[PDB]
Design a protein around this ligand. Structure first.
Ligand SMILES: NC(=O)c1ccc[n+]([C@@H]2O[C@H](COP(=O)([O-])OP(=O)(O)OC[C@H]3O[C@@H](n4cnc5c(N)ncnc54)[C@H](OP(=O)(O)O)[C@@H]3O)[C@@H](O)[C@H]2O)c1
Ligand SMILES: NC(=O)c1ccc[n+]([C@@H]2O[C@H](COP(=O)([O-])OP(=O)(O)OC[C@H]3O[C@@H](n4cnc5c(N)ncnc54)[C@H](OP(=O)(O)O)[C@@H]3O)[C@@H](O)[C@H]2O)c1
Lengths: 524, 529
């Protein structure tokens, strides 16, 4: 009578939604945590204030000045980490180590952009490439420039990364001088809203630079105009709804989508069980199934191995999966916590039942008692490993994503004369993915194989014994590398270091007297 | 009975559409020229043959091998230019000099990419920037690459540039290893179809690399898949129709739009009538009104001048417009020919009456007899110059474009404290444009003002005395410079030299051991900065 109603931050003010709100709950214990509501907000005013007051204030600052503000946010969020870990344990049901992927991944990505940003200097627009002569006598030349878009950036983010989804987008947006309006997924919104409230309360950014709305999305796209940008992370079906809106179809606002992806792991023909690359493959597949209970868009969903390796691979995955204990993340003995909600628990079990129509269930620890959790309250699903003997004729293998601790292993036919050619073709049947990982003992071979996967995967991640200590993980997104993929993964691009700024800028060719191209360059 | 029905080239074959087809006519003389039809074509196979055979054949070649094919196409088109000029005179009604903007503009842009493409090298993927370390010991790093998309490129092109609209798109697409399906605008499709026919008949590109469909567009987007790309040039209204299609909304295919634009020209406060930059402004406004009868998407539509300079600017534009003679381009005395069609003629004349409800008509040579043409047969419109004294409250100036030899002059209030601040605000009321041009005697001043226009204009073109003889023209699209603009101009990007390749490629981050990055590096290239 009652949990806290979290306020929205719109038009420079904290404003509660009306009504009873939507309750966020702990997915292990069932406790009611906080509520959200966007009912009754003045959305025209929220967008116009951000666009006008926020954008004008951010563009008045140089790139290096906005970078310095990002570095102050880093220090603030670092100081408040204990509060954020408590929210993540309760609202997301994740182990400490899994909560770190979201909290400390967010902070690390914001700090990387704060450091990249300081290098951009005390200017208000960036040069794109070098000057080029447009005349034999070099009297008339051209220089391309990037200028901040005079709009707002609206982020409609997914439930799995309330912190990193915010900061992976907000860091390049704010560095680019574009005000941010974040709309986190309701079930896990609390951490996003507490991080925004901490940053707003600190007065690091100007009024209007950072707004948040939690609750119903109704009305938001209707406020988007032609110079604004929208970044959506979520299901392919929802993305298709969004793409049809007049903001994009009529008004031409930029849209990035990152959607569902059936990411692959390919065990190379040389990586037989008596070689060190084989255990790296087994370990990475079990990690990606179990971190966050498989709720990473980049997790391994399909693992292709030589026919001759199939049984040794199943045996080694079963042995390693059996060490994953499941239950309340407050217990230090737990290796894997819950899904984000009981609704997701039901959705995952329905996905598992669907895949089982067409695959053999090779490992399922559902009957292992949970630790410190009631299976009728909590949203804990145990690891399930499927085997699909004939991946050429399988329907569901290459089409159906289960967003939980669930993956399928399938054999491929080694080519005797790349040995992994059939595995590349199978990977492609995922219709475009965020990431594939490839495992061999031969580094040079991995550089050649990577090129064959590049046109269908936004990232190719090569693990071999030489980098056992340094490879950064199949599903962990490093901010200097591109994040996105073609086709089913949404056709989007994020991060990639400075590449992420282009989405927030308009590019222009300036063609002028060569002296003027000089004075341009002194300002850029 | 009857004129030639132009065939389509699809799935490696020349196929006629069925039915009587659509007649293309000479917009000066009314003669029936040729017909087109897409009726009955097997679009599934047109797209699958292009995507499978055309894509695989192009991807088997290196970038420099595809660039050498583009160079062979330049020599072929150069040898055939007399045929192309005869088709341009009859189908487009343009003077020889105006026809050159399409024909020789197209060939020049193709040759630019053939030369640039040779510097992409003997590889099948391009390097995007350089390695970045992901580890303290530098054992694990990331390298981005670009790979050709495993799709087709569908071009839906506008009526004004049958040649340049084909080659400005096809040069970077074929250099990128992506097969092309072009769909030119019907009214002026003949030149596009003859150029494609000459190139296909020469056997320079592999089968499937270059296809053409003329006639109805029905069914084309239904064949687009998620790795394909679509480049549309034409009206903003038609672009919004296309954006709603499942090819984009469900299947996520890339789309570029270039639409119309109310491009500005701004006379700076320093450029008073007694100075050299004033005359350069008057000349560039008249050239952009009159080349191709104003039918460039980049043409100046709104000219903003200081209040004090309004009357001298109107007087000088009137005197220079009065030298423009209108009529049959076959007559050497004609400086400006016709619009592309009698339909466009009626649209332009309705737009002129609409603007005139809110603007004064300062110049119009409509009463001058056409040279060697009948007003009731030719699609000729004389230049019309409007003046809008109050551009702040103007209801049409910043919103309604007439796609003909028509522009509006409006005064701005000079700021003294950028002197052109008001003009920049007014230019932004066009809601996003391909180009703005600026005119001053002071070259330093120009670099500053250009930055203020850059977030609303895809190109800012500064004309001043030191570049009187070298500046490349407000409306002329140089292929090394970006073409496109935000907002009303479509949100699209084309050309910009190497920048045009990204649209045809898929970018990937490869994260791997040092030795793996080295082997993948040996298989990539990017030209030296
Ligand atoms: N692509 C991936 O990475 C991926 C993979 C697997 C699972 N999923 C999960 O899907 C969960 C559930 O689905 P989803 O988020 O895509 O659909 P969703 O659950 O129905 O909604 C996601 C965000 O979209 C907003 N949305 C829905 N329609 C909208 C509209 N018309 N205009 C503006 N916003 C609108 C919703 O706002 P409301 O609060 O008004 O509903 C929601 O919060 C995600 O948070 C995501 O992880 C995503
Ligand atoms: N909106 C603007 O202000 C704007 C912007 C840029 C350019 N333009 C002008 O537009 C002129 C040519 O285009 P337009 O305005 O006359 O009409 P348009 O349709 O926008 O012209 C582009 C092409 O779109 C094709 N098209 C029309 N409907 C289509 C459909 N439902 N599906 C697929 N394709 C379709 C047309 O083919 P067909 O010829 O076979 O009908 C046309 O050739 C150019 O000369 C350019 O100057 C206007």
């Amino acid at each position: 009578h009652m949990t806290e109603l979290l306020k929205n931050h719109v038009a420079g003010q904290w404003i509660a939604g009306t009504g009873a709100g939507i309750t966020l709950t702990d997915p292990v214990t069932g406790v009611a945590l906080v509520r959200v509501s966007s009912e009754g907000l003045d959305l025209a005013r929220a967008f116009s204030f951000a666009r006008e007051d926020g954008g004008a204030a951010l563009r008045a600052l140089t790139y290096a000045q906005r970078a310095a503000r990002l570095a102050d946010i880093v220090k603030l969020l670092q100081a408040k980490r204990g509060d954020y870990y408590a929210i993540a344990t309760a609202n997301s049901g994740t182990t400490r180590n899994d909560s770190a992927v979201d909290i400390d991944g967010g902070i690390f990505t914001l700090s990387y952009y704060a450091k990249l940003g300081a290098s951009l200097g005390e200017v208000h627009a960036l040069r794109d490439g070098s000057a080029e002569s447009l005349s034999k006598d070099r009297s008339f030349s051209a220089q391309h420039v990037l200028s901040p878009t005079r709009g707002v950036a609206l982020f409609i983010n997914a439930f799995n990364f309330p912190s990193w989804g915010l900061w992976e987008k907000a860091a390049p947006a704010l560095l680019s001088g574009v005000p941010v309006i974040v709309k986190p997924a309701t079930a896990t919104a609390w951490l996003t809203q507490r991080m925004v409230a901490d940053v707003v309360d600190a007065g690091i950014l100007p009024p209007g630079a950072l707004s948040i709305i939690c609750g119903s999305s109704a009305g938001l796209l209707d406020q988007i105009r032609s110079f604004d940008v929208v970044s959506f992370t979520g299901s392919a079906d929802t993305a298709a709804t969004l793409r049809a809106h007049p903001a994009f179809v009529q008004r031409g606002a930029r849209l990035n989508v990152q959607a569902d992806s059936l990411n692959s792991a390919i065990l190379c023909a040389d990586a037989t069980p008596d070689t060190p690359a084989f255990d790296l493959f087994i370990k990475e597949v079990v990690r990606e199934m179990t971190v966050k209970s498989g709720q990473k868009c980049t997790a391994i969903r399909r693992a292709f191995v030589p026919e001759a390796a199939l049984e040794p691979v199943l045996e080694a995955l079963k042995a390693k999966l059996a060490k994953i204990t499941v239950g309340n993340p407050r217990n230090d003995a737990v290796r894997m916590g819950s899904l984000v909600s009981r609704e997701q628990y039901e959705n995952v079990l329905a996905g598992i039942a669907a895949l089982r129509e067409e695959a053999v269930l090779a490992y399922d620890s559902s009957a292992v008692p949970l630790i410190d959790a009631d299976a009728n309250i909590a949203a804990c699903v145990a690891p399930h490993l499927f085997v699909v003997n004939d991946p050429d004729n399988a329907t569901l293998l290459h089409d159906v994503e289960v967003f939980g601790p669930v993956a399928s292993v399938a054999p491929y036919r080694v080519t005797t004369d790349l040995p992994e050619a059939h595995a590349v073709a199978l990977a492609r049947r995922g219709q475009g993915s965020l990431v594939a990982s490839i495992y061999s003992n031969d580094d040079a071979h991995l550089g050649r194989l990577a090129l064959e996967l590049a046109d269908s995967h936004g990232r190719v991640h090569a693990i071999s014994p030489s980098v056992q200590h340094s490879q950064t993980g199949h599903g962990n997104v490093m901010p200097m590398s591109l994040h996105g993929g073609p086709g089913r993964a949404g056709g989007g691009e994020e991060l990639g270091g400075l590449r992420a700024l282009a989405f927030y800028h308009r590019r222009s060719a300036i063609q002028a007297a060569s002296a003027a191209i000089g004075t341009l360059t002194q300002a850029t």
